[PDB]
Amino acid sequence: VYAWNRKRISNCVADYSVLYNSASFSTFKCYGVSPTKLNDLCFTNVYAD
Amino acid sequence: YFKIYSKHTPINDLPQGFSALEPLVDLPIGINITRFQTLL
Amino acid sequence: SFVIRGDEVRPGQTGKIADYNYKLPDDFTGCVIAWNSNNLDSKVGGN
Secondary structure (H helix, E strand, O other): OOOOOOOOOOOOOOOOHHHHOOOOOOOOOOOOOOOOOOOOOOOOOOOOO | EEEEOOOOOEEHHHOOOOOOOOEEEEEEEEEOOOOOOOOO | OOOOOOOOOOOOOHHHHHHHHOOOOOOOOOOOOOOOOOOOOOOOOOO
């Protein structure tokens, strides 16, 4: 609540949030993207909140 | 992110000329930068 | 007809159900009804 980071690291190679793709972790909502295209799409933001 | 661009050139006030600066760095920072000082 | 706790109750989705249970078409035409069977699935664990 007093913290929403954005850049824990500037460069990640271990990016596979399957937590969303298979919902292996929990419920979610994706905006503007498929939940499954996690290794097909890339962004320069790797962390938040 | 934070950006810095620069250009090397001889300078003959700040005489005019036509050019564009090229990036040096692109660094995500998240800093509410509002003021600065230069260093000698 | 099926029983699901995986992905809770939940055709425009790719979740624990879609890939590991069943996928309804993104254009699926029909209705879905989900009845919590906590008191109806008998053995609650429902392994």
